[PDB]
C-alpha cells in the first residue's frame, strides 16, 4: 500500500518505479538460483551475479 | 458486452431524465447546473448466477434494472451554463444514433 499500482482509463494497470526495480531484482535472483542449481559454468554465473 | 449510451437509466428519477432526448443526450439550449446529467450511460455487470433473491428482484421490478450500472456524465460541482453544442464521434462499423 506504500507502492500502489496506478489504475487509469481503459484498464491499464501501469506499474511504478519501485515495482519495476523489485521485478528486476526478483528476476535476476530467480535466474541466479536456477543457474546455481544446474551447476552452470562460472563464466555465466559471474555475469549473473 | 459494450457500454450503452441511453436515456433508460433505472435507478434515477423521472425529473433528472427530463433534459435528455431519446438518445440519452442533453438538449441544445438546456440550462444546467452542478450535478445534472449530460450524457446517460450504463455499464454492464451481468452474470449467469441468479439466486432466488435476484429472481424476486427481476420479477417485481423488471429485468432492465438489473445487470446494469450507472456511469453517466454529470456536470461537475460548482459548474453551470447553457448547452450550446454537442459533438458525437462514432467508430467505423458502429451503428449511428439519431443525434449523430
Amino acid at each position: 500500500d506504500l507502492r500502489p499500482l496506478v489504475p487509469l482509463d481503459g484498464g491499464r494497470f501501469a506499474t511504478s518505479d519501485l515495482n519495476d526495480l523489485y521485478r528486476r531484482v526478483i528476476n535476476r535472483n530467480n535466474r541466479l538460483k536456477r543457474l546455481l542449481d544446474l551447476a552452470a559454468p562460472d563464466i555465466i554465473v559471474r555475469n549473473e551475479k | 458486452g459494450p457500454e450503452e449510451i441511453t436515456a433508460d437509466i433505472p435507478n434515477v428519477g423521472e425529473a433528472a431524465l427530463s433534459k435528455l432526448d431519446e438518445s440519452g443526450i442533453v438538449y441544445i439550449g438546456a440550462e444546467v447546473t452542478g450535478g445534472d446529467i449530460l450524457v446517460g450511460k450504463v455499464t454492464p455487470k451481468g452474470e449467469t448466477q441468479l439466486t432466488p433473491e435476484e429472481k424476486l428482484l427481476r420479477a417485481i421490478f423488471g429485468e432492465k434494472a438489473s445487470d446494469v450500472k450507472d456511469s453517466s456524465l454529470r456536470v461537475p460541482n460548482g459548474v453551470s451554463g447553457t448547452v450550446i453544442d454537442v459533438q458525437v464521434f462514432t467508430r467505423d462499423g458502429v451503428e449511428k444514433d439519431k443525434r449523430a
Binding site: 500500500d1 494497470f13 506499474t15 523489485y22 526478483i26 528476476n27 530467480n30 | -
Partner: protein, 97 residues
C-alpha cells in the same frame, strides 16, 4: 469480546526516543511475514493478486476487510482465523500498509 478488540486497535504507542542501527539478516527475517518469490503483481484474469508475488495476500494481508482470498471466511465472527486453503488471515485490509 468485540469491545476490547475494537478498542485495542485505536491505541497509540508510547515512546520517548528513536534508535537507529544496522539490520541483521535475522532482524530482516523477523520483520517479514513471508518471502516474495515471483515478480507477478496482478492476475489480470480474476484481477486478484498473484500468489507469492509483490502483492500477495498471504504475505501482506487481505485485500478486503475480514475476508480471505478464496472466500470461505468473510465476517467479523472469523476474525484472526488463518484460512487453510489460501493462507490469508481474516483481518483488516490496512495491515497492507
Amino acid at each position: 469480546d468485540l469491545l476490547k478488540f475494537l478498542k485495542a486497535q485505536t491505541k497509540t504507542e508510547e515512546f520517548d526516543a528513536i534508535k537507529i542501527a544496522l539490520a541483521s539478516p535475522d532482524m530482516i527475517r523477523s520483520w517479514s511475514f513471508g518471502e516474495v518469490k515471483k515478480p507477478e503483481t496482478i492476475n489480470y484474469r480474476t484481477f486478484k493478486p498473484e500468489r507469492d508475488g509483490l502483492f500477495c495476500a498471504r504475505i501482506f494481508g487481505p485485500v478486503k476487510d475480514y475476508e480471505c482470498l478464496c472466500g470461505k471466511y468473510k465476517r467479523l465472527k472469523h476474525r484472526g482465523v488463518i484460512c487453510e486453503k489460501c493462507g490469508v488471515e481474516v483481518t483488516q485490509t490496512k495491515v497492507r500498509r
